[PDB]
Amino acid sequence: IGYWIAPCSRLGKILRSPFMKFVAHAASFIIFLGLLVFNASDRFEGITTLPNITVTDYPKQIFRVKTTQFTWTEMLIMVWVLGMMWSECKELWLEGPREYILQLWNVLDFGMLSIFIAAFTARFLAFLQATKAQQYVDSYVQESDLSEVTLPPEIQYFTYARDKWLPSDPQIISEGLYAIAVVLSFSRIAYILPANESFGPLQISLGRTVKDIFKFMVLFIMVFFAFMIGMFILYSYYLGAKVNAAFTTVEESFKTLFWSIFGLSEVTSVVLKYDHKFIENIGYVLYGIYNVTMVVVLLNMLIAMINSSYQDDSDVEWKFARSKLWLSYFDDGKTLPPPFSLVP
Amino acid sequence: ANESFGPLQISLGRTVKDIFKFMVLFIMVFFAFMIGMFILYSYYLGAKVNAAFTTVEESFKTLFWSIFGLSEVTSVVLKYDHKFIENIGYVLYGIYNVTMVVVLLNMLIAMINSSYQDDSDVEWKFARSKLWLSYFDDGKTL
Ligand SMILES: [Ca+2]
């Protein structure tokens, strides 16, 4: 408000400093994360009502209206997402799309903002359907609090609890995408992390280790696909004849072999319920060979990365990254935080 | 004060001091995934096989014990047919495990390089001499 009223003043001059603009953007993102956390402040200790029970503020309300309506925190977070997307679009328009895509931070921000937009679009579609159902109830139902009246099946579905929801209804998609976007949001803390002396080189080395890990992960993915296909072919014919129905389908085989990396897949994944001990013993051998192979690949990755790191260069890289961060703020255009940049 | 265990204690102290810096970043990642999974699974309290991500405390427990592999995979599955949310939770839990492995491996490599760069002997003897000088005063007689 002060910047809008007096763009050229002591406060205006202070707020246009590159460090002050960086602090403004960091504070805006902290407020965005606070809104993300506060939107779910009614569930910190868990939801009181069971998923099979519907609660409505007034007796003539469709439950989906109550469970899909936006709150003021939802409005604020939608405005924040719109502002950040507008800032990203302005950057892409001004500087060029090809250069914009070839940057980790820009593409990640675009991805998380797109996921937020998709989640809010799905929630808005659910809200529209619920509002149409509520309008139908208010215009054609006057039967004492939705007890004696039986709604048409096109609209009776909106009186159902969470358990009766279709697996592909808009609100489930909305909340899944919202969870993904919330996970991706806090990853932008590492965008402002390099500006700090202690946490800059750490982030630089973390990015370098991720880049080194990716190439080994490609080979491990090839080995993983090999064992997934082999064990799925071995155990596909035993669906109702296995202990934990693992390796019976491509999804199940993929889950079992992926969670085996962290030791979270039990050995009974290879045991059958029949007397075909040959198949069970081949599965045991293949699973053991897979575990030994993944340990060998992890050991080779660790050793190769240790050698590569053993080959004062991190300080230079961190200072270069921090200087890029600074030069991103020296231009006077990026003055206000993205949520407040909408107002012209 | 011991010759054989003093250097070990000094090295352990330096290891803890190096570990804290990476622990800050891992705490940021941990909070990210804790909030995400809690938001995903807060609406399924009695609709899950266990109470893994139903609350913030529960999400913190599940993700912290996931570091040591002491949290079961079934923490993600649901008792409903909402396979979209279950698969999103599976992907997020797998990404959390991969991310924590990456962070731990990066911490290990960075600390190995830092240690690679008769240095601990001087530190140990300085600490031992500080311990000695703490007792040269006549006040601490008993
Ligand atoms: Ca950007």
Tab-separated table of N, CA and C in Angstrom, chain A residues 144-215:
chain	number	residue	atom	x	y	z
A	144	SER	N	-39.092	-31.279	4.060
A	144	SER	CA	-38.722	-31.387	5.473
A	144	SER	C	-37.335	-32.018	5.647
A	145	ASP	N	-36.331	-31.266	5.191
A	145	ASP	CA	-34.929	-31.495	5.541
A	145	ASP	C	-34.349	-32.749	4.893
A	146	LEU	N	-34.762	-33.050	3.661
A	146	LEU	CA	-34.134	-34.090	2.841
A	146	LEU	C	-34.179	-35.464	3.505
A	147	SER	N	-35.232	-35.740	4.275
A	147	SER	CA	-35.377	-37.030	4.941
A	147	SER	C	-36.342	-37.948	4.199
A	148	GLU	N	-37.590	-37.510	4.023
A	148	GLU	CA	-38.586	-38.338	3.355
A	148	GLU	C	-38.408	-38.352	1.842
A	149	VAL	N	-37.816	-37.307	1.275
A	149	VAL	CA	-37.696	-37.187	-0.173
A	149	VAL	C	-36.528	-38.032	-0.663
A	150	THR	N	-36.709	-38.661	-1.820
A	150	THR	CA	-35.662	-39.423	-2.486
A	150	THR	C	-35.241	-38.667	-3.739
A	151	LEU	N	-33.991	-38.221	-3.768
A	151	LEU	CA	-33.500	-37.437	-4.888
A	151	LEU	C	-33.234	-38.332	-6.099
A	152	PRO	N	-33.259	-37.764	-7.303
A	152	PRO	CA	-32.934	-38.556	-8.485
A	152	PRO	C	-31.507	-39.052	-8.417
A	153	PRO	N	-31.212	-40.192	-9.050
A	153	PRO	CA	-29.846	-40.737	-8.989
A	153	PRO	C	-28.789	-39.802	-9.548
A	154	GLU	N	-29.148	-38.919	-10.483
A	154	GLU	CA	-28.193	-37.926	-10.966
A	154	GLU	C	-27.753	-36.990	-9.848
A	155	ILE	N	-28.588	-36.825	-8.825
A	155	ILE	CA	-28.300	-35.905	-7.734
A	155	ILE	C	-28.201	-36.601	-6.382
A	156	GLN	N	-28.740	-37.814	-6.233
A	156	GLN	CA	-28.588	-38.545	-4.978
A	156	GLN	C	-27.124	-38.826	-4.667
A	157	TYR	N	-26.280	-38.919	-5.699
A	157	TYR	CA	-24.854	-39.141	-5.486
A	157	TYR	C	-24.204	-38.018	-4.692
A	158	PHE	N	-24.717	-36.794	-4.800
A	158	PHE	CA	-24.128	-35.667	-4.089
A	158	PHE	C	-24.520	-35.619	-2.619
A	159	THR	N	-25.440	-36.472	-2.180
A	159	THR	CA	-25.795	-36.580	-0.774
A	159	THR	C	-24.982	-37.648	-0.057
A	160	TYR	N	-24.020	-38.257	-0.740
A	160	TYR	CA	-23.250	-39.363	-0.198
A	160	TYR	C	-22.009	-38.866	0.535
A	161	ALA	N	-21.498	-39.718	1.419
A	161	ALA	CA	-20.296	-39.416	2.183
A	161	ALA	C	-19.068	-39.632	1.303
A	162	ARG	N	-17.880	-39.567	1.907
A	162	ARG	CA	-16.651	-39.733	1.140
A	162	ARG	C	-16.503	-41.153	0.607
A	163	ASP	N	-17.011	-42.147	1.338
A	163	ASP	CA	-16.812	-43.535	0.932
A	163	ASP	C	-17.542	-43.864	-0.363
A	164	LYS	N	-18.693	-43.242	-0.607
A	164	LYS	CA	-19.479	-43.539	-1.796
A	164	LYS	C	-19.045	-42.743	-3.019
A	165	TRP	N	-18.047	-41.871	-2.890
A	165	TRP	CA	-17.587	-41.089	-4.030
A	165	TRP	C	-17.011	-41.995	-5.109
A	166	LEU	N	-17.242	-41.621	-6.364
A	166	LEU	CA	-16.609	-42.322	-7.465
A	166	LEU	C	-15.099	-42.104	-7.410
A	167	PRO	N	-14.307	-43.113	-7.779
A	167	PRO	CA	-12.846	-42.961	-7.706
A	167	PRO	C	-12.298	-41.881	-8.619
A	168	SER	N	-13.053	-41.458	-9.634
A	168	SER	CA	-12.593	-40.451	-10.582
A	168	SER	C	-13.396	-39.159	-10.497
A	169	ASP	N	-14.081	-38.916	-9.382
A	169	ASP	CA	-14.844	-37.688	-9.242
A	169	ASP	C	-13.889	-36.503	-9.101
A	170	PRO	N	-14.338	-35.296	-9.456
A	170	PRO	CA	-13.397	-34.167	-9.544
A	170	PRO	C	-12.686	-33.829	-8.246
A	171	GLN	N	-13.330	-33.994	-7.088
A	171	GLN	CA	-12.719	-33.516	-5.850
A	171	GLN	C	-11.551	-34.396	-5.419
A	172	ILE	N	-11.622	-35.700	-5.688
A	172	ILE	CA	-10.500	-36.579	-5.364
A	172	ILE	C	-9.280	-36.213	-6.199
A	173	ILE	N	-9.484	-35.978	-7.497
A	173	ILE	CA	-8.406	-35.483	-8.347
A	173	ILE	C	-7.878	-34.164	-7.806
A	174	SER	N	-8.786	-33.286	-7.374
A	174	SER	CA	-8.389	-31.985	-6.854
A	174	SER	C	-7.484	-32.128	-5.642
A	175	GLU	N	-7.858	-32.986	-4.694
A	175	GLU	CA	-7.069	-33.084	-3.470
A	175	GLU	C	-5.765	-33.838	-3.695
A	176	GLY	N	-5.745	-34.821	-4.597
A	176	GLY	CA	-4.477	-35.448	-4.941
A	176	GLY	C	-3.503	-34.474	-5.581
A	177	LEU	N	-3.979	-33.702	-6.562
A	177	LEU	CA	-3.121	-32.704	-7.187
A	177	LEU	C	-2.729	-31.610	-6.205
A	178	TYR	N	-3.625	-31.247	-5.287
A	178	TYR	CA	-3.286	-30.263	-4.271
A	178	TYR	C	-2.196	-30.775	-3.344
A	179	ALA	N	-2.243	-32.055	-2.970
A	179	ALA	CA	-1.172	-32.624	-2.160
A	179	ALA	C	0.151	-32.612	-2.911
A	180	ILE	N	0.126	-32.968	-4.198
A	180	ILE	CA	1.354	-32.922	-4.993
A	180	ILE	C	1.898	-31.498	-5.055
A	181	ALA	N	1.015	-30.520	-5.260
A	181	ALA	CA	1.447	-29.130	-5.350
A	181	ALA	C	1.986	-28.624	-4.019
A	182	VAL	N	1.385	-29.049	-2.906
A	182	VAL	CA	1.898	-28.666	-1.594
A	182	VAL	C	3.283	-29.257	-1.374
A	183	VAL	N	3.487	-30.507	-1.795
A	183	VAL	CA	4.815	-31.106	-1.697
A	183	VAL	C	5.817	-30.317	-2.531
A	184	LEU	N	5.427	-29.929	-3.747
A	184	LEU	CA	6.342	-29.210	-4.628
A	184	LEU	C	6.576	-27.768	-4.194
A	185	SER	N	5.655	-27.173	-3.434
A	185	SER	CA	5.806	-25.775	-3.044
A	185	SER	C	7.041	-25.573	-2.180
A	186	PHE	N	7.169	-26.354	-1.107
A	186	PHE	CA	8.289	-26.168	-0.194
A	186	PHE	C	9.629	-26.434	-0.866
A	187	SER	N	9.631	-27.082	-2.032
A	187	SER	CA	10.866	-27.243	-2.788
A	187	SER	C	11.389	-25.917	-3.322
A	188	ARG	N	10.563	-24.870	-3.334
A	188	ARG	CA	11.039	-23.554	-3.741
A	188	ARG	C	11.781	-22.832	-2.627
A	189	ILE	N	11.835	-23.405	-1.424
A	189	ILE	CA	12.704	-22.858	-0.387
A	189	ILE	C	14.155	-22.916	-0.840
A	190	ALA	N	14.525	-23.984	-1.546
A	190	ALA	CA	15.871	-24.098	-2.087
A	190	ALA	C	16.153	-23.075	-3.181
A	191	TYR	N	15.132	-22.377	-3.681
A	191	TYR	CA	15.376	-21.277	-4.609
A	191	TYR	C	16.050	-20.106	-3.908
A	192	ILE	N	15.583	-19.759	-2.703
A	192	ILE	CA	16.188	-18.677	-1.929
A	192	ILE	C	17.278	-19.175	-0.994
A	193	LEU	N	17.424	-20.489	-0.844
A	193	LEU	CA	18.488	-21.033	-0.006
A	193	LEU	C	19.896	-20.590	-0.401
A	194	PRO	N	20.292	-20.548	-1.683
A	194	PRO	CA	21.697	-20.226	-1.988
A	194	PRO	C	22.125	-18.835	-1.560
A	195	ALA	N	21.182	-17.928	-1.296
A	195	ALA	CA	21.548	-16.589	-0.850
A	195	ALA	C	22.211	-16.593	0.520
A	196	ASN	N	22.118	-17.692	1.260
A	196	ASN	CA	22.713	-17.801	2.583
A	196	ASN	C	24.097	-18.433	2.493
A	197	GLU	N	24.990	-17.990	3.380
A	197	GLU	CA	26.370	-18.465	3.345
A	197	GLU	C	26.471	-19.932	3.739
A	198	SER	N	25.768	-20.334	4.799
A	198	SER	CA	25.882	-21.703	5.291
A	198	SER	C	25.147	-22.694	4.396
A	199	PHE	N	23.967	-22.323	3.904
A	199	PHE	CA	23.093	-23.243	3.190
A	199	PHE	C	23.222	-23.146	1.675
A	200	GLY	N	24.151	-22.345	1.169
A	200	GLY	CA	24.371	-22.230	-0.253
A	200	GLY	C	25.165	-23.385	-0.832
A	201	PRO	N	26.402	-23.565	-0.356
A	201	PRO	CA	27.211	-24.689	-0.848
A	201	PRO	C	26.563	-26.036	-0.611
A	202	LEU	N	25.785	-26.177	0.463
A	202	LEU	CA	25.076	-27.428	0.703
A	202	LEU	C	24.082	-27.713	-0.413
A	203	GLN	N	23.307	-26.703	-0.811
A	203	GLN	CA	22.361	-26.887	-1.905
A	203	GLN	C	23.083	-27.147	-3.219
A	204	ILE	N	24.215	-26.475	-3.439
A	204	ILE	CA	24.980	-26.698	-4.663
A	204	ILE	C	25.459	-28.143	-4.736
A	205	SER	N	26.031	-28.642	-3.639
A	205	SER	CA	26.497	-30.022	-3.608
A	205	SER	C	25.341	-31.004	-3.724
A	206	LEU	N	24.183	-30.677	-3.144
A	206	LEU	CA	23.019	-31.546	-3.275
A	206	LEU	C	22.573	-31.653	-4.726
A	207	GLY	N	22.527	-30.525	-5.435
A	207	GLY	CA	22.192	-30.570	-6.848
A	207	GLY	C	23.205	-31.356	-7.657
A	208	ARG	N	24.490	-31.178	-7.348
A	208	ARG	CA	25.526	-31.938	-8.043
A	208	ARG	C	25.376	-33.433	-7.796
A	209	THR	N	25.062	-33.822	-6.558
A	209	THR	CA	24.861	-35.233	-6.256
A	209	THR	C	23.633	-35.790	-6.957
A	210	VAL	N	22.560	-35.005	-7.072
A	210	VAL	CA	21.388	-35.464	-7.818
A	210	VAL	C	21.750	-35.693	-9.282
A	211	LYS	N	22.483	-34.743	-9.872
A	211	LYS	CA	22.898	-34.888	-11.263
A	211	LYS	C	23.783	-36.111	-11.460
A	212	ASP	N	24.681	-36.384	-10.510
A	212	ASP	CA	25.508	-37.585	-10.599
A	212	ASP	C	24.678	-38.849	-10.416
A	213	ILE	N	23.695	-38.811	-9.515
A	213	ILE	CA	22.885	-39.985	-9.215
A	213	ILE	C	22.020	-40.372	-10.403
A	214	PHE	N	21.598	-39.395	-11.210
A	214	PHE	CA	20.658	-39.690	-12.292
A	214	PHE	C	21.224	-40.702	-13.289
A	215	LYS	N	22.497	-40.554	-13.666
A	215	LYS	CA	23.060	-41.449	-14.674
A	215	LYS	C	23.130	-42.886	-14.168
